[PDB]
Amino acid sequence: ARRPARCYRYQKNKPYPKSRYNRAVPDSKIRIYDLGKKKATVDEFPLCVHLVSNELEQLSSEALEAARICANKYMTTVSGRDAFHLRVRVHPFHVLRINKMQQGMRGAWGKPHGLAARVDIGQIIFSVRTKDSNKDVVVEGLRRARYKFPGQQKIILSKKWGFTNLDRPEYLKKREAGEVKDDGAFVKFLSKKGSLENNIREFPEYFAAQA
Amino acid sequence: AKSKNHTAHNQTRKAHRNGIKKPKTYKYPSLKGVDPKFRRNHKHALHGTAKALAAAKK
Amino acid sequence: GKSHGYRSRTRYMFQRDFRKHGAVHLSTYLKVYKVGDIVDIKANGSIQKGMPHKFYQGKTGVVYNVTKSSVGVIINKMVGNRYLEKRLNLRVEHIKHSKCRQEFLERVKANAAKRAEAKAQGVAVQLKRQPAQPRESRIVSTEGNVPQTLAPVPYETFI
Amino acid sequence: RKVLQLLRLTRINSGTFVKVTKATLELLKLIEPYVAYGYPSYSTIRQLVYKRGFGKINKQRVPLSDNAIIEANLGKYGILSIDDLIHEIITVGPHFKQANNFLWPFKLSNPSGGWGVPRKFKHFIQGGSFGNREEFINKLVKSMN
Amino acid sequence: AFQKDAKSSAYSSRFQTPFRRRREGKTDYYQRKRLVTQHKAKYNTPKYRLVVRFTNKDIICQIISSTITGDVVLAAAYSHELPRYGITHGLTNWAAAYATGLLIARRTLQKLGLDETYKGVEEVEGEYELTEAVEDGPRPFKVFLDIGLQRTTTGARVFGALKGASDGGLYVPHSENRFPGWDFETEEIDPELLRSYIFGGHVSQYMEELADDDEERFSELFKGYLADDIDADSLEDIYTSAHEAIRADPAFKPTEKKFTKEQYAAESKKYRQTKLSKEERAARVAAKIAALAGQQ
Amino acid sequence: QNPMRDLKIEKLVLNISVGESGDRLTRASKVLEQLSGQTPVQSKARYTVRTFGIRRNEKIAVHVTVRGPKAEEILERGLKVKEYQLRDRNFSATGNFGFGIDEHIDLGIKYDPSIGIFGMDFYVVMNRPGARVTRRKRCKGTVGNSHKTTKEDTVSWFKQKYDADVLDK
RNA sequence: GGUUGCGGCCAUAUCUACCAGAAAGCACCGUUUCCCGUCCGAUCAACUGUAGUUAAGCUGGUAAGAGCCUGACCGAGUAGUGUAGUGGGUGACCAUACGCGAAACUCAGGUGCUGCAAUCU
RNA sequence: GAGAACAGAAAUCUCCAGUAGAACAAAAGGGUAAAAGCCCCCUUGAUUUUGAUUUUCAGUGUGAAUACAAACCAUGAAAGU
RNA sequence: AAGCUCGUAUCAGUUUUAUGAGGUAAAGCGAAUGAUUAGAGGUUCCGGGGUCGAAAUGACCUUGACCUAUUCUCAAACUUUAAAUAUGUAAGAAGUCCUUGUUACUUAAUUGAACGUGGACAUUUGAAUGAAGAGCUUUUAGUGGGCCAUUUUUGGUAAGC
Ligand SMILES: [Mg+2]
Ligand SMILES: [Mg+2]
Ligand SMILES: [Mg+2]
Ligand SMILES: [Mg+2]
Ligand SMILES: [Mg+2]
Ligand SMILES: [Mg+2]
Ligand SMILES: [Mg+2]
Ligand SMILES: [Mg+2]
Ligand SMILES: [Mg+2]
Ligand SMILES: [Mg+2]
Ligand SMILES: [Mg+2]
Ligand SMILES: [Mg+2]
Ligand SMILES: [Mg+2]
Ligand SMILES: [Mg+2]
Ligand SMILES: [Mg+2]
Ligand SMILES: [Mg+2]
Ligand SMILES: [Mg+2]
Ligand SMILES: [Mg+2]
Ligand SMILES: [Mg+2]
Ligand SMILES: [Mg+2]
Ligand SMILES: [Mg+2]
Ligand SMILES: [Mg+2]
Ligand SMILES: [Mg+2]
Ligand SMILES: [Mg+2]
Ligand SMILES: [Mg+2]
Ligand SMILES: [Mg+2]
Ligand SMILES: [Mg+2]
Ligand SMILES: [Mg+2]
Ligand SMILES: [Mg+2]
Ligand SMILES: [Mg+2]
Ligand SMILES: [Mg+2]
Ligand SMILES: [Mg+2]
Ligand SMILES: [Mg+2]
Ligand SMILES: [Mg+2]
Ligand SMILES: [Mg+2]
Ligand SMILES: [Mg+2]
Ligand SMILES: [Mg+2]
Ligand SMILES: [Mg+2]
Ligand SMILES: [Mg+2]
Ligand SMILES: [Mg+2]
Ligand SMILES: [Mg+2]
Ligand SMILES: [Mg+2]
Ligand SMILES: [Mg+2]
Ligand SMILES: [Mg+2]
Ligand SMILES: [Mg+2]
Ligand SMILES: [Mg+2]
Ligand SMILES: [Mg+2]
Ligand SMILES: [Mg+2]
Ligand SMILES: [Mg+2]
Ligand SMILES: [Mg+2]
Ligand SMILES: [Mg+2]
């Protein structure tokens, strides 16, 4: 009863969220977006590889969920479940309608059918962090997930240090200085702005210079 | 038996044949709806100054 | 069915400006209007009484009547292929003196000056406005400023 | 459409002069798809007027052919010969409005060489024919005059 | 403050501050709006107010008009001027209120020309009466009471002000039911009472009664009255004489001054902390990551 | 530093929560009257609870605010009933404090079987001079930090004059 | 320059934490016969200016402070957009031509100005 | 939030924070803080006359509304409303 | 269709300059409302379990919510900001300045307000471009099924819908 994905590939509609105006919309088929060793510290996994869209289209909750499994299944069984951090960068917030069927074309407003993510050119879909000594496994995993999606996506080796917004050197520079400090699975950076007093609290290991 | 419901198609073609007539403007417009207390007085004021030109032609 | 009441579609129009709610400052009330003045029209949502219809929002007209709490503004609205005169009864909160006239009024006084000012010397004036002219010639030096050569740049990803 | 009219271009291949200021620049901007233009040299202004130069006189589009026609109508502004007329145009003198309105829109033929392009209705810059082509306007006009 | 109190940047960012003069709790804009604004067809005609404020024991009376650059004092009188007219004590009582307002009406009325015509009530039996307009002649000077934030209790002394500004000559529109001597349960004023207050009859009777029942207190407060020898009875004659003094010459003498503006300026900057330079401030921080960082 | 950041009592508010209208309430009322000499004030229920048996606006409880000397008496008086021992709670961090007693008779006042026995909430609220700022009409303001009643300040205050105890931790 | 009464613009004025304030002013502050309001003279009313105090208010200064304000070829001529083509592409969409052109970001600089009247070492 | 006998998740008392996160018959959207909300006091302007005006428009009607004139009143110390 | 009153005149599906209005596109979400992935650190006399317990307003784990600083993602009926294209008014003789008359309106007031008398300054008189002129009046036909293309765009899987 799922219509072929062909029927909702394109963005022909303004976004139709779940809302007080909508209300009875089916649960999203994808529901975990963070797999693998997601507790992992930022220094642990420096290499970042992305799965990136090349089309303005729509991806189903279903195709994200399938793709998710595929990439994650490959990744762990080849290189272990704590070798990587998989992140789905895309949430399926757009409801699709269906005119299920006495009447005819009269009064044809549809009912919620399923969910989709609306996605740009260059929009990042999957993101992965690991150790460089794993690129190919990770890459191969994103390659296998590709087959689960409509339209062309292309995998891209990042310049950034894991899920961070800093290039590897600039991150190294901020770190082997004092400016960086660990947090959940991300990180916090000393600012030159704000109270001096409780800027020294946090980041004690700064406020020197040398070694 | 359904039909076209509504359209502006061709309406500004029509408005522009004879033109969108600019508003036309007069010196001495009407006092239509101007404060009646003012007007009542303004009336006697004018009576007065008129008198004083008939007077200045004695 | 459809809905077309007086203040329809006006949700954001009559809204109040970020962090500018509440009393209206007294200067609004201290300003003075005279028949013949030009005013711009814009509704204060907090003043429901004597309020312009949404059509007249952002419209500029001439004052024709001065009353205890209000002014009468005539606006020419175009309906069909023609204008009709419209007279609005606006409260002073929904009106302000227009500047659409200052660059003229200030230019008139100015004109009168350099007119008499010049004349007294021995004429040669030119006081019509003129459009941006094109640029005249000019020589640009290189001293401390040899031209930097740029090329286009290769394609790259950073992401 | 209104701008082509205000510039007096109401038929294909006709042409007129335009003194350049911001207040006309923007008119030119608005009609780039339908016109070609550029900076005329003395030679081509001279030959436009000598050959297809007509005054407007009680309307009535009148050929220049003799200087008394010019002086009767523009003598008021100085300007009492055909080469005066030209001098007023090319220097964009103090009476360019009167001088230039006096000239009827020039009525040109199709270029004799041809257009140099497979398709007219792209900009000069894209191997097409419209827009400001600057000094290359002269070769066109001459081939059309 | 408390921690689980304390403000988020979001709260602060969206906060719309009231008019300054409300934050100060000094101006009621709702009242001001309706006091100040004028008939739009009376054009540039100012709308004067009789502002009456009480400090901890100075009375302030100004006649004020409005301007979008700010207000405009026409005239001012303070009850601290009353020693000039023979009133040294109790400069905040109901009759110091009356006197000052009388001073303010006489002063302005004077500097306006209406000094002679429109004398007000000279007799003063505290009868209820506002000042009528001279047949063929200028309308009286009209002024509206700005109570400010005062509560309107019947007996409030802000209306004492009102009484002698009206008894002074001014047309200050007013009803009678907040004057001392208005009987709650009959729409009627006893003026024997209201007269009594105008002349300070309540303060004196307090003095007479305190005399023979408790001179412990009578000496504590009323110290000045003993010290300058004034037992009660005289009080009415004091203010009666004051009244007359004021009409004789309300024309406002300023203080002799001593020391210049420039002078007051100088000695006041001796006590004024000066803002720092941003270069300086950068070397308090640099100084701070010397000590608080560089390990002692 | 202290000149007159002396620690007066703002007010004592005695409160009887008699969760019901009718006689038993007008009696609790009568207690608070003769206890304060002031004619006491009544409270209506905020909403309806039904397993407390009350209805919205029922008149459910009486109380009374008492200020100056008269307040110190009743305080001190009930303070005896509490054997001059409170607890480290009872003292709000804004610096006020209260206690309860059952049976009003343990503070003068005879018994009388026609008025019965009533429990009572004592609540002392402390402040200093210059508090008028917060409460007055014009130029309403807020008492500066080092002028605010706090728990410490009030406990030490309480522990000194009265010479009572605090207990617990 | 301070302060006050009345203001204009209504955060460069607000918020958090500290410290400093001469003189006058303001203030806190004392009282309850009178007018007046309260459950309560706390608010409100009156009376004293006497008995007391800068503690608070108030004003000002401090802070790699939170907020706000201003600027900048900081980002960005980026996003978006008016106009053109028998331009590319199965398409989704995309490039080019003549123009208009943001927001976030980032960094720097600020933190009430001012009218009328009175008063003051 | 922190406090007070019975008293509990919820009864009534107090202080602190509090830009409105409430409330204003009702749909929703606008608006509003010494108010437009809550408590109290006095009321009938929800009245009288007959015109002009804005929306819908044909620039007809109806509905609704706006600002004045001419009465008579209400409230307030008052400007006012 | 008939004209009629006028004629450099006044006119404009245009630009420029000056001064307004607007909440779409973009953008935003470590900004409000509303959604949404992940951890990290806090907080309970107070949501439930569990160990020690005679209990505790006890201690220790525990999982919940709440809080703090962070993190991935979104909005036709969200939003601080905020375009481009469109859009109101203005660019003078019906103008500007001087003197000082009229009234029953209005001012404390010969104050103002409104309408005026008398006086002073002309085509660079107040931006551009154009104008086979402009203004005006009467009367009457047909029509009142529409369809298509680019762009914006709703419903619909879609349609030569
Ligand atoms: Mg589209
Ligand atoms: Mg659709
Ligand atoms: Mg069907
Ligand atoms: Mg059928
Ligand atoms: Mg239906
Ligand atoms: Mg339906
Ligand atoms: Mg988007
Ligand atoms: Mg694919
Ligand atoms: Mg970021
Ligand atoms: Mg049909
Ligand atoms: Mg059909
Ligand atoms: Mg039809
Ligand atoms: Mg609708
Ligand atoms: Mg109404
Ligand atoms: Mg031309
Ligand atoms: Mg040839
Ligand atoms: Mg050939
Ligand atoms: Mg050849
Ligand atoms: Mg071809
Ligand atoms: Mg040829
Ligand atoms: Mg908080
Ligand atoms: Mg923050
Ligand atoms: Mg406010
Ligand atoms: Mg009031
Ligand atoms: Mg002290
Ligand atoms: Mg019960
Ligand atoms: Mg103060
Ligand atoms: Mg002192
Ligand atoms: Mg007292
Ligand atoms: Mg008082
Ligand atoms: Mg101090
Ligand atoms: Mg800061
Ligand atoms: Mg575009
Ligand atoms: Mg195309
Ligand atoms: Mg692009
Ligand atoms: Mg509502
Ligand atoms: Mg108010
Ligand atoms: Mg009715
Ligand atoms: Mg009809
Ligand atoms: Mg109608
Ligand atoms: Mg809209
Ligand atoms: Mg939007
Ligand atoms: Mg959008
Ligand atoms: Mg944004
Ligand atoms: Mg949000
Ligand atoms: Mg336009
Ligand atoms: Mg011409
Ligand atoms: Mg002609
Ligand atoms: Mg017909
Ligand atoms: Mg017909
Ligand atoms: Mg018909």
Output the DSSP codes for D123-138: BGGGTSSBEE-GGGHH
DSSP characters for A72-92? HHHHHHHH-TTS-EEEE----
**Do B35 and C80 make contact, defined as CB atoms within 8 angstroms?**
no
CB–CB of D103/D15 below 8 Å?
no
| β-pair type (C60-66, A94-98) | unpaired
User: What is the C-alpha separation between C24 and A56, in angstroms, rounded?
Assistant: 48
The DSSP secondary-structure symbol of F85 reads: B
Dihedral angle sign, alpha carbons of residues A32, A37, A41, A47:
negative
The Cα–Cα gap between F57 and F93 comes to 32
List subunits contacting chain B, requiring 3 or more Cβ pairs under 8 Å: C
Distance from CA(C10) to C1'(G78), angstroms, rounded? 34
Say which amino acid occupies E130.
Answer: L
Q: Around Cβ D71, how many Cβ atoms within 10 Å?
A: 15
Report the C-alpha gap between D55 and E26 in whole angstroms: 79
Cα atoms in the 13 Å half-sphere on the side-chain side of D21 = 10
How far is the C-alpha of C93 from the C-alpha of C25, rounded, in Å? 10
Sort D106 into a burial class: Cβ within 10 Å, 0-12 / 13-18 / 19+.
Answer: buried
Closest to A158 in 3D by CA, of A144, A174, A171:
A171
Which one-letter amino acid corresponds to residue F150?
Answer: T
Helices E94-112, E234-248: axis angle to 10 degrees equals: 20
- Token pair belonging to A111: 């009912």
**Could you tell me which residues come within 8 angstroms of residue E49 by beta carbon, excluding any fewer than 6 positions away?**
E35, E36, E63, E64, E65, E143, E144, E145, E146
Strands D131-132 and D36-37: parallel
CA–centroid distance, D5 to ligand 19, in Å, is 30
Nearest alpha carbon to residue A5 among A121, A154, A148: A148
Å between A44 CA and nearest CA of chain C: 19
**Would you give the end-to-end CA distance of chain D in angstroms?**
25
CA angle C70/C74/C77 to nearest 5° reads 135
Which residue from A167, A181, A142 is spatially nearest to A51, judged by alpha carbons? Answer: A142
Beta bridge partners of F66: F12
* Strand I close to A122 by CB, under 7 A: no
Is C103 strand, coil or helix? helix
Distance CA A122, CA A51 (A): 9
D19 CB neighbours strand I below 7 A:
yes
Which of E192, E194, E190 has the alpha carbon at shortest distance from E167? E194
**Which residue of C20, C30, C46, C70 to mutate against E (max E Cβ within 10 Å)?**
C30
Q: Contact, A84 vs A129, CB < 8 A?
A: yes
Amino acid making up residue F130: G
User: Could you give the CA distance from residue C100 to residue C40 in angstroms, rounded to a whole number?
Assistant: 9
Amino acid at E142: K
Read off the amino acid at residue F81: V
Please name the residue that has the structure tokens 């993101």: A127
Spatial CA neighbour of A177 closest among A211, A143, A132:
A211
Assess B6–C contact: CB distance below 8 Å, yes or no: no
* Sequence-ordered list of residues with C-beta below 8 angstroms from that of D30, at least 6 positions apart, any chain: D3
Whether D134 contacts chain C with CB within 8 A: no
Q: How many CA atoms lie within 13 A of E238 on its CB side?
A: 24
On whether the CB atoms of residues F99 and F44 are closer than 8 A, the answer is: no
| C86 closest CA partner among C96, C98, C73, C103 | C73
Q: Considering every ligand atom, which ligand is closest to the CA of C11? A: 41
- φ/ψ of A154, rounded to 5, equals -135, 135
Closest in F93, F137, F139 to E24, CB measured? F139
Q: How far apart are CA F93 and CA F71, in angstroms?
A: 22
* Amino acid sitting at position C124: A
End-to-end CA distance of chain E: 31
Amino acid identity of residue A68, one-letter, is R
Nearest to E131 by CA among E81, E177, E183, E166: E166
Residue A53 burial by CB count (10 A; 0-12/13-18/19+): exposed, middle or buried?
A: buried
Rounded-to-integer distance, Cα B16 and Cα B22, Å: 12
Question: What one-character DSSP code corresponds to residue C58?
Answer: T
Counting DSSP H helices and E strands in chain B, the numbers are 2, 0
Which positions on chain G have an atom < 7 Å from some protein CB?
1-2, 4-11, 13-23, 25-31, 33-37, 39-68, 82-87, 91-94, 96-99, 107, 109-112, 114-121
Strand stretches in F5-127, DSSP E = 9-16, 41-43, 61-66, 97-101, 120-126
> What is the three-class DSSP state of E85?
helix
| Cα gap C34→C62, rounded to integer Å | 10
List the one residue out of A171, A168, A180 whose CA is nearest residue A205.
Answer: A180
The reply to whether A89 has its C-beta less than 7 Å from any atom of strand I is yes
Asked if A66 contacts A146 with a C-beta cutoff of 8 angstroms, the reply is no
Please tell me which residue lies nearest to nucleotide H2, judged from CA to C1': F92
Residue type present at position F12: L
Give CA–CA dist E53/E32, Å, rounded: 15
Cβ-based contacts of C79 with chain B (< 8 Å): none
Chain C neighbours among B 14-43 (CB < 8 Å)? 14-16, 18-24, 29, 32-35
C-alpha to C-alpha distance for F167 and F169, rounded to whole angstroms: 7
CA of B46 vs chain C CAs: smallest distance (Å): 18
| CB-based contact, A158 to chain C, within 8 Å | yes
Half-sphere exposure of D71 (CA within 13 A, CB side): 5
Number of H helices, E strands in chain F: 4, 5
Angle between helices D67-74 and D82-90 (to 10 degrees): 60
The closest alpha carbon to E96, from E58, E128, E55, E125, belongs to E58
The separation between CA F166 and the C-alpha centre of its own chain, rounded to angstroms, equals: 18
CA-CA-CA-CA dihedral for E273, E279, E280, E284, to nearest 10: 130
Burial bucket for residue E114 (CB in 10 Å: 0-12, 13-18, 19+) = buried
Q: Does C19 contact E41 at a Cβ distance shorter than 8 Å?
A: no
The closest alpha carbon to F127, from F111, F109, F146, F149, belongs to F149
Q: Which structure tokens are listed for E172?
A: 């200050």
The C-alpha angle with vertex A100 and arms to A97 and A104, in degrees rounded to 5, equals: 115
- Tell me the CA–centroid distance for residue D127 and ligand 33, in Å: 22
A28: Cβ contacts below 8 Å, ≥ 6 apart: A61, A92, A115
**Local structure of residue A5 (DSSP, 8 states):** G
Pick out residues 46-105 of chain C having their CB under 7 A from any atom of nucleic acid strand I.
57-61, 75-76, 98-104
Q: For residue F30, give the H/E element and its range.
A: helix F23-36
Burial class (CB in 10 A: 0-12, 13-18, 19+), B38: middle
Covered bases, chain I (protein CB within 7 Å) = 11-24, 31-32, 34-40, 45, 57-58, 67-77, 80-81, 87-92, 94-96, 101-117, 121-122, 124-133, 135-136, 145-148, 153-159
C-alpha C42/C-alpha C52 separation (Å) is 8
- Amino acid making up residue E279: E
DSSP 8-state symbol, F105? G
Q: Could you tell me where the DSSP H helices lie in D7-136?
A: 22-29, 42-52, 67-74, 82-90, 96-102
Strands A187-189 and A180-182: antiparallel
CB A25 within 8 A of CB A115: yes
C1'-nearest nucleotide to the CA of F1: G55
Residue C72 in contact with residue C88, Cβ under 8 Å?
yes
Distances (CA, A) of A5 to A10, A54, A96, A148, D37: 10, 18, 11, 11, 53
Q: What is the resolution of this structure in A?
A: 2.9
Q: Do chains D and B touch (3 or more CB pairs under 8 A)?
A: no
Q: Do the Cβ atoms of E30 and C69 come within 8 Å?
A: no
E26 touches chain F (CB under 8 A): yes
**Partner-chain residue, chosen from A196, A207, A208, that has the shortest CB–CB distance to E285:** A196
First to last CA, chain F: 28
Cα separation, F59 vs C66, in Å, equals 57
CB A45 within 8 A of CB A133: no
| Other C-beta atoms lying within 10 Å of the C-beta of residue E79 | 26
Compute the distance from residue C129 Cα to the ligand 3 centre, in Å.
67
Are chains E and A in contact at 3+ CB pairs closer than 8 Å? yes
Kindly report the number of other CB atoms within 10 A of residue E248's CB atom.
10
Separation of alpha carbons A116 and A149, rounded Å: 12
Whose structure tokens read 């006006």?
Answer: C10
d(CA F78, CA F106): 8
E189's CB contacts (< 8 A; 6+ apart) are E128, E176, E177, E179, E181, E182, E183
The CA angle E14-E20-E23, to the nearest 5 degrees, is: 80
Residue D144: which of D24, D38, D26 has the closest Cα? D38
Closest to A188 (Cα-Cα) out of A170, A197, A175? A175
Two tokens, residue C95? 């009106």
- Say how far apart CA A138 and CA A158 lie, in whole Å: 13
Residue E296 CA: distances (Å) to CA of A195, E102, F93: 20, 71, 36
Among E68, B39, B34, B37, smallest CA distance to C70 is for B34
Structure token pair of residue F77: 């008086």
- Going by C-alpha positions, the residue among D115, D118, D75 that lies closest to residue D95 is D75
8 A C-beta contact, residue F62 and residue F18: yes
Closest chain A C-alpha to E57 CA, distance in angstroms: 46
d(CA B38, CA B34): 8
Q: Cβ(A115)–Cβ(A94) under 8 Å?
A: yes
Q: How far apart are CA A10 and CA A55, in angstroms?
A: 10
- Contact status, residue E164 vs residue E250, Cβ threshold 8 Å: no
CA proximity to E180, closest of E157, E205, E207: E157
The CA–C1' separation of F126 and G39, in angstroms, is: 19
Asked if E143 and E171 count as a contact pair (C-beta separation under 8 A), the reply is: yes
Contact A196/E294, CB-based, under 8 Å?
no
CA of F103 to C1' of G29 (A): 40
How many helices (H) and strands (E) chain E has is answered by 12, 6
Interface test with C, best of E40, E42, E67 (most C CBs within 10 A): E40
Compute, in angstroms, the gap from residue B1 CA to the centroid of ligand 11. Answer: 8
Give C37 Cα–ligand 14 centroid separation in angstroms.
29
Using CA atoms, how far apart are residues D15 and D9, in angstroms rounded to an integer? 6
Q: Both tokens of residue E209? A: 């009664």
Spanning CA of C19 to C1' of G14, the rounded length in angstroms is 12
Q: Are D110 and D13 in contact (CB under 8 A)?
A: yes
The separation, in Å, between residue E185 CA and nucleotide H42 C1' comes to 14
Where helices occur in chain E by DSSP H, the ranges are: 9-13, 20-23, 29-36, 94-112, 158-168, 191-198, 201-211, 215-220, 223-227, 234-248, 261-269, 278-291
The single residue listed with the structure tokens 């009415």 is: E236
**Whole-angstrom distance, CA of residue C120 vs CA of residue C112:** 12
Beta strands in chain A (DSSP E): 34-36, 47-60, 85-88, 94-98, 111-130, 153-157, 180-182, 187-189
Q: In angstroms, rounded to a whole number, what is the distance separating the alpha carbons of residues E155 and E194?
A: 9
CB F143 within 8 A of CB F134: yes
d(Cα E135, Cα C54) in Å, to the nearest integer? 51
**For tokens 């900057």, what's the residue?**
E269
DSSP state of D115: -
Could you tell me if E91 and E79 are in contact, meaning their C-beta atoms sit under 8 angstroms apart? yes
Bridge pairing between strands D62-63 and C95-97: unpaired
DSSP letter for each residue of E102-133: HHHHHHHHHHHSTTSS----SS------PPPP
What does the alpha-carbon distance between residue E226 and residue E230 come to, in Å, rounded to a whole number? 6
- As a whole number of Å, the CA-based R_g of chain E is 26
- Chain C residue whose CA is closest to A50: C159
As a whole number of angstroms, the distance between CA A143 and CA A162 comes to 19
Method used experimentally: X-ray
Location of structure tokens 């994808």: A30
Nearest to A138 by CA among A187, A70, A63, A84: A84
- Nearest partner of F48 among F61, F63, F58, F38, judged by Cα: F58
> In the structure encoding, which two tokens stand for residue E23, read together?
């934050």
Strands laid side by side in the F120-126 sheet = F41-43, F61-66, F9-16, F120-126, F97-101
Q: How far is C157 from chain A (nearest CA, A)?
A: 8
Nearest to A83 by CA among A128, A127, A145, A140: A128
- What type of residue is A204? P
Question: From the CA of D114, how far away is ligand 16's center (Å)?
Answer: 9
Tokens of A211: 């070694």
What SS3 class is residue D50? helix
Helix (H) or strand (E) holding B49: helix B36-54
Q: What token pair was written down for E246?
A: 């004021």
Residues listed for chain C = 159
**Residue C91 CB coordination number (10 Å):** 19
Q: What is the DSSP letter of F91?
A: B
- Assess contact for F85 and F165: CB atoms under 8 A: yes
A188 beta partners: A181
Q: C-alpha distances in angstroms, A6 versus A115, A120, C128, C134, F21?
A: 14, 18, 66, 57, 72
Distances in Å between the Cα of A73 and the Cα atoms of A68, A141, A152, A169, E80 are 8, 8, 22, 32, 92
Of the candidates C80, C70, C12, which has an alpha carbon nearest to the alpha carbon of residue C41? C70
